[PDB]
Amino acid sequence: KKFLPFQQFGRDIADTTDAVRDPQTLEILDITPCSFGGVSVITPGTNTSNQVAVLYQGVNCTEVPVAWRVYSTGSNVFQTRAGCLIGAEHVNNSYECDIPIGAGICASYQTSQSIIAYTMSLGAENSV
Amino acid sequence: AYSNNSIAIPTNFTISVTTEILPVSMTKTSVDCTMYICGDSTECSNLLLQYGSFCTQLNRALTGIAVEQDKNTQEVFAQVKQIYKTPPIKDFGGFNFSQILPDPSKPSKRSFIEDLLFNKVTLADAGFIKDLICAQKFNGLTVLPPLLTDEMIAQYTSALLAGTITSGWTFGAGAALQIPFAMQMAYRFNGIGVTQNVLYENQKLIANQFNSAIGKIQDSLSSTASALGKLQDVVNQNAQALNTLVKQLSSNFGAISSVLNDILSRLDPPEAEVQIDRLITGRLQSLQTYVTQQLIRAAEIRASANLAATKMSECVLGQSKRVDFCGKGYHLMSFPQSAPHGVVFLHVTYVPAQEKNFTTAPAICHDGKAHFPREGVFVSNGTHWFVTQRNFYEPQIITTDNTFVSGNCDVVIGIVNNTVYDPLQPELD
Amino acid sequence: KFNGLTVLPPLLTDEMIAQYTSALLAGTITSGWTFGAGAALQIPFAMQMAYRFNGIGVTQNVLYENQKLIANQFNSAIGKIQDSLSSTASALGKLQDV
Amino acid sequence: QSLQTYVTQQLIRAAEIRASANLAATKMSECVLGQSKRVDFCGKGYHLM
Amino acid sequence: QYGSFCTQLNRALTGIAVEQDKNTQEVFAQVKQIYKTPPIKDFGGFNFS
Numbered sequence A: 001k002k003f004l005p006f007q008q009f010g011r012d013i014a015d016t017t018d019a020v021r022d023p024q025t026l027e028i029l030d031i032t033p034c035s036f037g038g039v040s041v042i043t044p045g046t047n048t049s050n051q052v053a054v055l056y057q058g059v060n061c062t063e064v065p066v067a068w069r070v071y072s073t074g075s076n077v078f079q080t081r082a083g084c085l086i087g088a089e090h091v092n093n094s095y096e097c098d099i100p101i102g103a104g105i106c107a108s109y110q111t112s113q114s115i116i117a118y119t120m121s122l123g124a125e126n127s128v
Numbered sequence B: 001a002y003s004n005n006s007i008a009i010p011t012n013f014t015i016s017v018t019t020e021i022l023p024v025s026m027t028k029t030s031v032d033c034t035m036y037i038c039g040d041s042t043e044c045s046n047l048l049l050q051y052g053s054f055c056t057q058l059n060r061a062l063t064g065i066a067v068e069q070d071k072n073t074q075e076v077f078a079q080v081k082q083i084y085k086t087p088p089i090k091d092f093g094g095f096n097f098s099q100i101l102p103d104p105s106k107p108s109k110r111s112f113i114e115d116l117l118f119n120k121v122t123l124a125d126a127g128f129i130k131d132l133i134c135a136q137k138f139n140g141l142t143v144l145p146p147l148l149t150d151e152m153i154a155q156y157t158s159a160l161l162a163g164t165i166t167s168g169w170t171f172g173a174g175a176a177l178q179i180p181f182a183m184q185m186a187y188r189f190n191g192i193g194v195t196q197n198v199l200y201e202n203q204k205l206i207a208n209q210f211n212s213a214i215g216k217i218q219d220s221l222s223s224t225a226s227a228l229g230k231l232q233d234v235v236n237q238n239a240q241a242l243n244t245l246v247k248q249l250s251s252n253f254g255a256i257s258s259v260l261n262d263i264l265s266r267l268d269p270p271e272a273e274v275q276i277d278r279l280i281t282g283r284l285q286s287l288q289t290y291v292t293q294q295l296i297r298a299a300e301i302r303a304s305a306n307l308a309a310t311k312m313s314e315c316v317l318g319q320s321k322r323v324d325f326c327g328k329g330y331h332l333m334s335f336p337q338s339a340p341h342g343v344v345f346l347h348v349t350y351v352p353a354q355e356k357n358f359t360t361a362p363a364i365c366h367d368g369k370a371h372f373p374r375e376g377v378f379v380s381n382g383t384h385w386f387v388t389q390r391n392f393y394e395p396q397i398i399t400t401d402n403t404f405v406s407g408n409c410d411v412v413i414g415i416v417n418n419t420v421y422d423p424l425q426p427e428l429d
Numbered sequence C: 001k002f003n004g005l006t007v008l009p010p011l012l013t014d015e016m017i018a019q020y021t022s023a024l025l026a027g028t029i030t031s032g033w034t035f036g037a038g039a040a041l042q043i044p045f046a047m048q049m050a051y052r053f054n055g056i057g058v059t060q061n062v063l064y065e066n067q068k069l070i071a072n073q074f075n076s077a078i079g080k081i082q083d084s085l086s087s088t089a090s091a092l093g094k095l096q097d098v
Numbered sequence D: 001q002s003l004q005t006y007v008t009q010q011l012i013r014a015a016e017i018r019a020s021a022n023l024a025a026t027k028m029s030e031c032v033l034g035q036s037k038r039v040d041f042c043g044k045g046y047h048l049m
Numbered sequence E: 001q002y003g004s005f006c007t008q009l010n011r012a013l014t015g016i017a018v019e020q021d022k023n024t025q026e027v028f029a030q031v032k033q034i035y036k037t038p039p040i041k042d043f044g045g046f047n048f049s
């Protein structure tokens, strides 16, 4: 941004500063908020098992290791258009949707049992 | 020109195609209290715990709306659970469906008209992994992606068309049963009361009219701007509401300042509380207003989505007889297309034209007997009498195979004299 | 009214609505159900009733032999409607509630 | 606060009236401009007009 | 010092006010020619007066 020589700040629609001028070396710095988002826990019933997977919404995976932490070791970290998914492994088959994660992805609990994530299937194919 | 012995009958017809747009869903949104009100402040949070469970309730409400949206889409589009395909050879009797069938030369296999529709509407907040966009987002406001991507809805729509044109209305009741297309159309005329030999003798005419009507839809859509107002309104309203919510963070509500870090960096706690409390009250009221109006809009959209599901079941998978439910005229058939946040129906309909004048009568007295039409009506060409069907002028001689007898001819008001020809006697003649 | 409160007039006056209704009746009784699908095509009234019995599964024969009986019953029914309306008070509750 | 209460209740009533108006439009279109076969949609008995 | 409560209230009430006229238009404007009934009233014995 080209602060003119007489200017000092830059404000937001909600009256929050988002640029500034360093009072010693007169240069312009942008200010950006840190990352935030929800946390979704995906579970089969407690009657069936005590295992879970975790979804960090709208957050690129790298920043989860940056910031309980007994899962982020991973070995099965996966990046979906809905966020960063941890604790579930990716298969190549397509089934019908069981628990909806979003953006076309669902997850289920199956086989030595685990939690798998796949792309839902619309139905069988047929030619008249 | 009403009169008590005059009738008017059509002599030609016209095939009409028209469009209808319906909203189905809207944008899923999520808001976080403790960020919207007390951003990054522990004093404010401890002050907010004294209100109990307002914020849990707000989150539950918004989540309910968010789920209901996906339910809406599922009801409207998932009417079939096999993905039919159309054969490679396109001998459809002379009808041309090129502008509504899928097109492989695009990354998303959408047809021509679906591309026009997707370029007409200017959507925002797509929600996928990431301008007023970020200014909004920086305050606890997020947008979630829908469950069905835009490339799956297109598959559903192409399945519905392929089924409709290769099998008819049978795939909506059981297994799909094939049948040539021209014979399908003959059935669909017997549906509206026109004899079926009218199609086999005017087949090229009908095909040409259908093709031209599709062409006009195409250009009229490719030119005019305000076709899709109904969808744009939804988008606009959502954007506006969200914008005003963000603006309300600049107000004082009577404190010394609208910035929370200034109140915290000047005064000592026992006097900072008196000010922070005022800020909390104002902002909490702002959220409640937002959530209430969102609930009411969601109810409206649900009503519209149920209507669209009914039209899909009754106009596309069958042939409707309810008047003006699937267009103006006598319904023949319909085709679906998808548009951003909604659906578009193309209704194909039959409209008579070229009418003429005749004189009529209710019955015929022959030998002290009264003959009535089995199906049709008696008309006079000026000197002679004929029977015809009611929707298309096509006269025939009066015999004892297309009339039936009942009573003598002393009681009907307006009966006329003529002769009724017996088919067997000329064989015996 | 004297505290910021106002009432606006509707766009369609009460004579335009009456014109619309009279148009609908005239079309219905002179042409049948054809004016809702295209151009209006005329047809005598008795024959239109014969069609409308064929619509419910009764032969059209039945009407032409019983025409005066049917006409009389229709007229009497309309008469009862009007006087019953002219007598009882709470017919229109649904509107008064609004 | 009094104004906000007023406006909210008015919005809900308006929604109810809209539903009723859609029903009336359908009855005009199907009972008057045609002959209906849906049972009890246009009265009790077999519909004529 | 409260900002935009009043623009919101006026906006809501205006929305309702317009929707009313939309309702009436939908119900009654089903035709777009104004038919007339003939001067002679030979309707077969029925009486619509």
Ligand SMILES: *[C@@H]1O[C@H](CO)[C@@H](O[C@@H]2O[C@H](CO)[C@@H](O)[C@H](O)[C@H]2NC(C)=O)[C@H](O)[C@H]1NC(C)=O
Pocket: B001, B002, B008, B355, B356, B357
């Ligand atoms: C059937 O005949 C009637 C009566 O001749 C026609 O109605 C007349 O049409 C002319 C031309 O527009 C008018 O000047 C007369 O006023 C009409 N008569 C009445 C009573 O209104 C009618 O046009 C004819 N049908 C067709 C299809 O032409």
Ligand SMILES: *[C@@H]1O[C@H](CO)[C@@H](O[C@@H]2O[C@H](CO)[C@@H](O)[C@H](O)[C@H]2NC(C)=O)[C@H](O)[C@H]1NC(C)=O
Pocket: B096, B097, B098, B099
């Ligand atoms: C169906 O109609 C389309 C028109 O949209 C026809 O495709 C056009 O065919 C002409 C004939 O040479 C070409 O000049 C155009 O460039 C074509 N348009 C497009 C968009 O490809 C198509 O041929 C018709 N179907 C059949 C079987 O003829």
Ligand SMILES: *[C@@H]1O[C@H](CO)[C@@H](O[C@@H]2O[C@H](CO)[C@@H](O)[C@H](O)[C@H]2NC(C)=O)[C@H](O)[C@H]1NC(C)=O
Pocket: B012, B013, B205, B208, B209
């Ligand atoms: C029914 O109407 C159609 C359409 O007007 C008539 O066919 C058209 O005739 C004109 C002149 O010959 C040309 O536009 C074409 O020959 C036809 N149009 C199309 C689109 O094919 C037809 O003649 C009319 N029916 C009768 C019996 O006259």
Ligand SMILES: *[C@@H]1O[C@H](CO)[C@@H](O[C@@H]2O[C@H](CO)[C@@H](O)[C@H](O)[C@H]2NC(C)=O)[C@H](O)[C@H]1NC(C)=O
Pocket: C075, C079, E047, E048, E049
């Ligand atoms: C047709 O129109 C009306 C109804 O049949 C008749 O005029 C009046 O209608 C009332 C309706 O209750 C009846 O009491 C009478 O028939 C009439 N009242 C008076 C005071 O005259 C009219 O006579 C009927 N017949 C004709 C030829 O129009």
Ligand SMILES: *[C@@H]1O[C@H](CO)[C@@H](O)[C@H](O)[C@H]1NC(C)=O
Pocket: A046, A047, A048
């Ligand atoms: C599941 O939990 C236990 C098994 O762990 C079983 O006894 C119980 O009946 C089950 N309850 C339900 C609701 O499935």
Ligand SMILES: *[C@@H]1O[C@H](CO)[C@@H](O)[C@H](O)[C@H]1NC(C)=O
Pocket: A060, A061, A062, B129
């Ligand atoms: C995630 O971040 C890495 C680097 O931080 C970047 O290379 C990658 O493109 C990002 N992916 C997404 C989906 O944001």
Ligand SMILES: *[C@@H]1O[C@H](CO)[C@@H](O)[C@H](O)[C@H]1NC(C)=O
Pocket: A090, A091, A092
């Ligand atoms: C299996 O999945 C991997 C990525 O997970 C992909 O590269 C590969 O093409 C898939 N195999 C098949 C047959 O689809």
Ligand SMILES: *[C@@H]1O[C@H](CO)[C@@H](O)[C@H](O)[C@H]1NC(C)=O
Pocket: B381, B382, B383, B384
């Ligand atoms: C049709 O009417 C004319 C008189 O306008 C008549 O000459 C002709 O015979 C009639 N039709 C037939 C098939 O005779």
Ligand SMILES: *[C@@H]1O[C@H](CO)[C@@H](O)[C@H](O)[C@H]1NC(C)=O
Pocket: B004, B005, B413, B414, B415, E042
């Ligand atoms: C039709 O109107 C004429 C007019 O004079 C009349 O003579 C006749 O009885 C009426 N009814 C008919 C022709 O059935």
